[PDB]
Design a protein around this ligand. Structure first.
Ligand SMILES: N[C@@H](Cc1ccc(O)cc1)C(=O)O
Ligand SMILES: N[C@@H](Cc1ccc(O)cc1)C(=O)O
Lengths: 317, 317
C-alpha cells in the first residue's frame, strides 16, 4: 500500500508477481520475506546494498526479514546476470566467506525488535545433507526442461554455453523458497533484477507442491552516462573497511554525478520524500555546493561504517 | 576379432564407439564389461534377454561380466526408448524388485569360473549416499546443457515434455560407468539400442575426468510383419515362471514366424553358425516340420527355466 508505493516512488520495484495481491497482504499482515546472498568473495560490495537496504525498509514497516547466506548455492554458482560460466570455488573457501558475509549482513538489520527481529540463515543447513535421489525426485519432478530453458539466465547462455551444474542452480534457489515458506512462513522473496527467473521457479515449486507467495525484484542501478553502476577505476567498492576504507567509500559517493545523485538518494538512503525533493530543488538552484552529494556520502557511509568512520572520512577529506 | 565378428554375423551389434579399438583390446585382454538393468517391474522379461545372453557370450569368450541392478536409477527413470514421462515408483517397491531381478540375472552368468566370474552390483551403493552438491559439481560440471539436449532420448521428448528428473538420468548412468571403470577396470558398456546416448555420456565423463573405454549397443529385435517384438495378445512374456509359465514361454517361441526364426536363433541361442545354417536349409526344404521353431523353443526355455521345466512344457503341449 504505502510501503509498496514508497518503493515505487524510490525506483526499487522492477517487477512483482502480483502487486495487488502483495499490497493487500503487506497491509494486512506481518510478512516474512527473504533475500539470498551468495559468497562469491570474502566481502559484500555495493552491488548488494539495494537488496540489503530494501530488506531494512521492509523491516522498518513492521515486516520480518530473513537474510540468507548462500553456503550451498555458492558451491554451484548462479548463471543469472553472468555472460560466462564461473569457476567453482572450494568448500573451504566458500565456508570461510560465508562467515564474513554473515557478519556484514547483520549490520543492516534489527535483531532486538520483538515481533519482527531478523534472522540470518545458511542454505547449507538444508542443501548440505540432501541426497541427489531425493533432490531429483522431490524437486526435479516438478520442472520440465522446457520451463527451465526459457529462463532468461539460461536462454541468455545456451549458445555461449552452460554446464548442467549452473543450469540446475534454479532448483536449489527454488527449494530455498519452499523450505523457508514451510519452516518460517516466508511469503515474499526479493532480489535484484536478474533473480526474476529463480524467484518465479520458487513460486512454481510452491504452487506445484502446495497449490499464496510473492516475488519482488529491484532494478539495476543506472547511470546517465550508460556505464555500469559500481564500475570504478579503483575496482570494486567493498563493504569491508579493510578492502575499501571509509574514506574511499565516502569519496565514491561524494563523486556521484549530478545526473545520478537524486536517483541514488532515493535508492540508498532513508531520507524522506520531502527531504529528497528539497535536495532536488537545492541541486537545481546551487549545484556547485554539492549538498545532494555530501548528504548521500554521509547517509550511506554511516549506514555501512558508522558515524566514527564517517567522521574520519570527513576529516581525512 | 572373432567374438566381435560372431556378434556381427548374429546381428547383435547395432553401434560401437570404436570397433578396431575394441576388437584389439578384446583380442589382447580379459575385458571387464557391464550391462545395467533397472527394476521397472518385479521380473525381467524377454526385452532384456538380448543384453543378458550377449553378456553370457562375452563371458564364454573369456571376459568378465558385471550385471548392474539399477537400485538408484530405478528411482529416477530412464526416458530412453519411452515416448512418455513415467511415474516414479517408491523406494520400497524398487528395493523389493531389485532383489528379484538380482535373482533372475544370476541364472545366466558364471560365478564359478576363476579368472572371469561374474559380479552382480547395485548402483544404490554409490548413488544412494551421494549428496546433491557433490553430484552437481563432480559430475555436472562436465556436461553442457547443449550436449545433453542433443541426446536422442531428450531430443525425442522436448515437445512431448520431460522433467528435469528424467533429463538428469544420463548423468547417473554416466557416473555408473565412471565408478565401474575406476573400481572394477570396466572398459566396455553394452546395452540395447536406446542406450547409445547414456553409454556415450559415460565415455564423455570418463574422457573429461581421466583423459580408453568402449560402448556397444544391441539392435532392437525385428519382426518381418513390422510389429513390436514381444508384443503378445497375452501381454508380456516374463522370465518369472510364476507370471509366465514355462509352457507359455515355450509356446511363445514355438510360434515364431518362419520369417523371424533364423534371426531369433542367431540372437537368442548358443547354436553354432553351421547349426544355424543347417536349420535354414531345413527351414527352406521342410517348413511344415517346424524344426527351427522347436530348436529355438527348447534352446531358450532351457536357458531360462532349465531342462525339467522344458520337459514339462514339451509334455504339456
Ligand atoms: N542467486 C542469488 C543468491 C541466492 C542464493 C540462494 C537463494 O535462496 C536466493 C538467492 C545471487 O546470485 O545473488
Ligand atoms: N538405463 C538402463 C538401465 C541402466 C541403469 C544403470 C546403468 O548404469 C546402466 C543401465 C535401462 O533403462 O535399461
Amino acid at each position: 500500500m504505502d510501503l509498496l508505493a514508497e518503493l515505487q516512488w524510490r525506483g526499487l520495484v522492477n517487477q512483482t508477481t502480483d502487486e495487488d495481491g502483495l499490497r493487500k497482504l503487506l497491509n494486512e499482515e506481518r510478512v516474512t520475506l527473504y533475500c539470498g546472498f551468495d559468497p562469491t568473495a570474502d566481502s559484500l560490495h555495493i552491488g548488494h546494498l539495494a537488496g540489503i537496504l530494501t530488506m531494512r525498509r521492509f523491516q522498518q514497516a513492521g515486516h520480518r526479514p530473513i537474510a540468507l547466506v548462500g553456503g550451498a548455492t555458492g558451491l554451484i554458482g548462479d548463471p543469472s546476470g553472468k555472460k560466462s560460466e564461473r569457476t567453482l570455488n572450494a568448500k573451504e573457501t566458500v565456508e570461510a566467506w560465508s562467515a564474513r558475509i554473515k557478519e556484514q549482513l547483520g549490520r543492516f538489520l534489527d535483531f532486538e525488535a520483538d515481533g519482527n527481529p531478523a534472522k540470518i540463515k545458511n542454505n547449507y543447513d538444508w542443501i548440505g545433507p540432501l541426497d541427489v535421489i531425493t533432490f531429483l525426485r522431490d524437486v526435479g519432478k516438478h520442472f520440465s526442461v522446457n520451463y527451465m530453458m526459457a529462463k532468461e539466465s539460461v536462454q541468455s547462455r545456451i549458445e555461449t554455453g552452460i554446464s548442467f551444474t549452473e543450469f540446475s542452480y534454479m532448483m536449489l534457489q527454488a527449494y530455498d523458497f519452499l523450505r523457508l515458506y514451510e519452516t518460517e512462513g516466508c511469503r515474499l522473496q526479493i532480489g535484484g533484477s536478474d533473480q526474476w527467473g529463480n524467484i518465479t521457479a520458487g513460486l512454481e515449486l510452491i504452487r506445484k507442491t502446495k497449490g499464496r507467495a510473492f516475488g519482488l525484484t529491484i532494478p539495476l542501478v543506472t547511470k546517465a552516462d550508460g556505464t555500469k553502476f559500481g564500475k570504478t577505476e579503483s575496482g570494486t567498492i567493498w563493504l569491508d573497511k579493510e578492502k575499501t576504507s571509509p574514506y574511499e567509500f565516502y569519496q565514491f559517493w561524494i563523486n556521484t554525478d549530478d545526473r545520478d545523485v537524486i536517483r541514488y538518494l532515493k535508492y540508498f538512503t532513508f531520507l524522506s520524500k520531502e527531504e529528497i525533493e528539497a535536495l532536488e530543488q537545492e541541486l537545481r538552484e546551487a549545484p556547485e555546493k554539492r549538498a545532494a552529494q555530501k548528504t548521500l556520502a554521509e547517509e550511506v557511509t554511516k549506514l555501512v561504517h558508522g558515524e566514527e568512520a564517517l567522521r574520519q572520512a570527513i576529516r581525512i577529506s
